[PDB]
From a paper:
WD repeat-containing protein 5 (WDR5), a core component of the mixed lineage leukemia (MLL) methyltransferase complex, directly binds to kinesin family member 2A (Kif2A) to regulate these mitotic events. In addition to transcriptional regulation, WDR5 also functions as a scaffold protein, facilitating the assembly of diverse protein complexes through its WD40 repeat domain, which forms a β-propeller structure. Emerging evidence suggests that the non-canonical role of WDR5 in mitosis is mediated by its interaction with Kif2A, a kinesin-13 family member that specializes in microtubule depolymerization.
Structural superposition of WDR5 in complex with Kif2A 114–122 and Kif2A 114–120 revealed nearly identical conformations, except around Tyr191. Here, Tyr191 rotates approximately 9° away from its position in the Kif2A 114-122-bound structure, leading to S7 site closure. Additionally, the interaction of the truncated Kif2A 114-120 peptide with WDR5 was weakened by 7.6-fold, indicating that Ser121 in Kif2A is crucial for its WDR5 binding.
Residue numbers in the entry:
A (entry chain A): 31 to 334
B (entry chain C): 114 to 120
Amino acid sequence: VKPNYALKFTLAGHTKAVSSVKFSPNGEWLASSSADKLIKIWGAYDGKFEKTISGHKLGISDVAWSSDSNLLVSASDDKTLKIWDVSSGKCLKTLKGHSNYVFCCNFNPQSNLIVSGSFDESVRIWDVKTGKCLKTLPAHSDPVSAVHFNRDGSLIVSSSYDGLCRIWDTASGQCLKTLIDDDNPPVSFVKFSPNGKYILAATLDNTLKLWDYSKGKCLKTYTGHKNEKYCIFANFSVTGGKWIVSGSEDNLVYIWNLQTKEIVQKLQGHTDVVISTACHPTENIIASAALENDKTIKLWKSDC
Amino acid sequence: GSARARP
């Protein structure tokens, strides 16, 4: 059983590298963020351009949707996050307090908190309603490459160039677990599985790993792609077959069978590093996006 | 640029 993702749309319009694409939780929209300082909204099913959202004064490294698909948060080199009203395009809040580039961000499922990670080596937890920073976690000893809440919001996972993945108690901010590798390769991405029991972690040694983080046991490894330089998003795909999806520095999207670890498909067509991939919440649809020689987003569809 | 799009 292998998927058959086929190219449906190429979305042009960003004028610098794309940095992150994410589907809205309600499946209607794709948001893209870019080094060109802009967010763009596109229809997930017909690829139609909807609007541009602007206001950051330097480039954007990540964007994320609220659980009701009504808000976005973005992380920028301008040391801020911004909360946006998707319908109006207006910046509702500017989140100030990081002292270097903000690299990654996410809402919790309740969507009353935002978590951010920064080049300043901290993880910050923010109140969505007020914009106040509630906690600053001294999370890592090098830039924080990813932050993610688990299914009920009670845990945060963070990853860093320092080689570590850490699990944090959201309520108290205390570190519950540190995952370590003896070779300490930079960890360039992490996220919880949809059910919250596992974490998927990328390291800059061309390797993805599935961890049972409570036992501290690596259950699966995925290889064959190229990832030595960039913080590339990876994903669980669960709408059809159970896959792992990642970008690659050889300009391809890689798809693996989660359980067997075999590569089941490679998607060709981008002309630069595929920095970001996203999986649609209900349809077998992948969004992918690439760096400066390409600057496009592609939408792909599979029958499984 | 943006930090994620730089090596």
